Amino acid sequence: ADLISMKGDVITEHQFYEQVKNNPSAQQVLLNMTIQKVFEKQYGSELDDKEVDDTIAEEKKQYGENYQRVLSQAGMTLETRKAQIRTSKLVELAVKKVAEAELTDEAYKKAFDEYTPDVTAQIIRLNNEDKAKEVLEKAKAEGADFAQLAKDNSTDEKTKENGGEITFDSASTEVPEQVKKAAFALDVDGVSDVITASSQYYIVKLTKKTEKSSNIDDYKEKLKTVILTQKQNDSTFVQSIIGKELQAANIKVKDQAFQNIFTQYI
């Protein structure tokens, strides 16, 4: 109950709460706790722990020895960050499930009209931007071998061996969004500009293009993936899903200090 003690006085946990409740950073914590509980009740039994555990494991490799430090500077630990990813994946799972159910034929067609089928291309991934520009000037030379440039310079171990080559749709998650839209904009044998997506630098050469069908029926599972991704990144949709899940949980704010921050949702 006592947080701090001194000569002739103490600070209690409740005294600490009564001061800190007006802090906007602390108000955000109660909002995020409420989003966690509501979404845990609704979709927590549907979300596997392996979905969270793989992502927190994935994130630990990206930072490595800096991971303990950066979390402590943000005021977090292994558990609190795990809860944050879990919360984020519960909202995403809810957006996925509500979107899936609302998939219309009129929706499938809109995606179908803007869809692109398999496109083979040679991609070179880079770290240094000075290298990326130096690789690009070589790629536009008279008899420039794009394959050897990929073999010599590219960081991507999987495509590096095969002269940077890769095949992908609009629905592929294995290549970035900015990289794909650059690839579809090119003519065949066209080399892209330096595409950017502690970030990564890409150059793409368009090799092949495949014909798209009239019949939508065979592209159903891939158009589904495009529409879901669009809904995952439509913030107006994501905020509605949060708002509607909170309204369905029937949250009552007991202390009036936290009344305004829930107004966006309630």
Add this chain to the structure above:
Amino acid sequence: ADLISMKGDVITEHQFYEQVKNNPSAQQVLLNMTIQKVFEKQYGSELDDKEVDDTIAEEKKQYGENYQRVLSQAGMTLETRKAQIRTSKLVELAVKKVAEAELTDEAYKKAFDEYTPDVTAQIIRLNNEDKAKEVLEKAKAADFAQLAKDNSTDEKTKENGGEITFDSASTEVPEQVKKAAFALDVDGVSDVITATYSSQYYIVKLTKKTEKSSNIDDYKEKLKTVILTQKQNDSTFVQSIIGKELQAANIKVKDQAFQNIFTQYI
């Protein structure tokens, strides 16, 4: 008590405490609560309430009609800010005492040596260097008061012939103007002095100069103010006084989560 309720669950105050205690902005609130209680205990009787009201009055004038908006951004009200300002003055007061107590004869000797008593002069300030050179050829040959009235940009001195009295400790006039002025003879005109958002140009005419007395007591309080004002703005000094006052209060941090924000002090 409960803070949020929903279908078959509540977020309790203690659960909110357990999440929010790691929040860096929250950790600052407890530290400030601890500083507020200790400094009130020791220096509260000495501090008069009127100069706390002078600061919040000045602060209300600065922001004007942005004050409630700026206060809400910080997560505060007029009352809680007035408490925060009171704490600042209690720390300021304690810092002043320890600075007063650490005054040596050597610091006075040094401050006395570097001090130059009040001189009276006439200054012309200009934005353009080549206009300052044009005005200087007139000034060095002349009615200096009129030249200031017609050319000077300093709106404070301009109207009364560019007239000004200052000593070495003066913050009204720049270092280079002061030093240039002290080095002049009476009725002498300086060269263009350049003070360094935007650099300015100056022409100084010395009217009068006070003779610096032998005895140090003649400028005792003026030198005391120089030495204390310097210590008041040293963050390292202020943070050391806070630390020593917290150690004299015999603080025990009971919750491990706050241990780190206190190690700098205790």
Add this chain to the structure above:
Amino acid sequence: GADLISMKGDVITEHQFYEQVKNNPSAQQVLLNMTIQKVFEKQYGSELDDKEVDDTIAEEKKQYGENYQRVLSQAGMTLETRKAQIRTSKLVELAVKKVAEAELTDEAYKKAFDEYTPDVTAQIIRLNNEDKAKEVLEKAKADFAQLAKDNSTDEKTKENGGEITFDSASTEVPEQVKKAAFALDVDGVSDVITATGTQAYSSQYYIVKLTKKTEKSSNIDDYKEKLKTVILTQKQNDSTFVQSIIGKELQAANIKVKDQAFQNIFTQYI
């Protein structure tokens, strides 16, 4: 030792003048400053290039102009020993930056990261009169770039439609202007902000229009360098800190004060 003054049937020698001048407070400071110079040259001298010292004294000569020679006399300096003083100052602040860097804790970085607010773009309109600021405020309830271009006293911002980018740590913008701007929403106009009438500056009045706001990241490393500089420049301007480093460095030299007259001026350090 030589003779400094000669009269009929008597002289003042250099040793006799020394034996009197050693009690002069100003003279005791000169021995202290000669001591600081020698120690800081031995330690950090090799690191400092002479070009930067030549830049400072060249800048300084332009600032004073033909006043400079006259001004150096009053400071107890010739051109040579001023150039040496500037060098010593640079060697001190160089040494203070190293120890400040070496004493950086994670809590210092964390506290700075918490209090720091990232770059926001905005348009400002500085004004001399209060009644004119009330006039422009109601008009700016609008093309804020035009209202800046016509009315703004700040000639730096006026050219680019009043626009400016700044952190919380920017000293280019006043504290109350920054705090007012961070409290706005995007495309939001503040009421009149007032920099009050003090001795140095006359009272200024500001109207702020927030244009862009960076979202504050979760990763400290995105702002590490800006947070590093604000913590270091704080310690650089702390007189107590600089004095402690000087005192530490003088203690490391193992200085023996031979003449008793100077013992007290060294006691603050040793």
Add this chain to the structure above:
Amino acid sequence: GADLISMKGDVITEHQFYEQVKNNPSAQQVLLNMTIQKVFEKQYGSELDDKEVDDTIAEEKKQYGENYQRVLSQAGMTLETRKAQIRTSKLVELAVKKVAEAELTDEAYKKAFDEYTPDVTAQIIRLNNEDKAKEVLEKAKAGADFAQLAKDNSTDEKTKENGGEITFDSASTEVPEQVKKAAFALDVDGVSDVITATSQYYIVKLTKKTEKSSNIDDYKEKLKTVILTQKQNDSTFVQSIIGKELQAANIKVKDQAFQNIFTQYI
């Protein structure tokens, strides 16, 4: 020459210290004072007994008490140099007196005579508070005996025990100029209003007024002492005497650093 400071692999010597310190304005003042001291000690020194200085030293030492060592330190000085300063001061005034005596003229005597007011006996009640002064002012004007009012109320310890009584002329420095001019304007046995000197508050009663004689010969020696004392307190006169005495010594400045500070005299 000897070593002042030593450290690892280096020393600062006396000559090195001299070559630096000689450009310092305060150090240049010391040498000018040493030169004034040696010249005046050579010419006039035999006339001044050290008892004269020792009496003045014992006066200061008895005043400040056991803070005497500290107040000398605070003034950038010691017993030996302060003793030398008093000595040099007394030899200058002694030398100035001789020139003043020889330059006495009947014009000078006539001007002193016109401004002179002869001996006046008056009872002064020195008061620290203005409220307490106006109370005693009422009591004196009523019936009342003025000697007891001074005994039972005056702060000046010397006059208090003698019934506030003191005798003086226009020359006497032991009573203030505002009090003297008030006293000369009263009628015999008349009481003044409250007088402010600057802040102490005086009430005068004129006991005895000497009628001023028509003959200058009746005040010859007193008027002489006025003229000489006036020449003593005239800074321009004193400086000129020091200046001319330095010229007579045939002073060569053997170092160009000190050339300018002597040029103020020679």
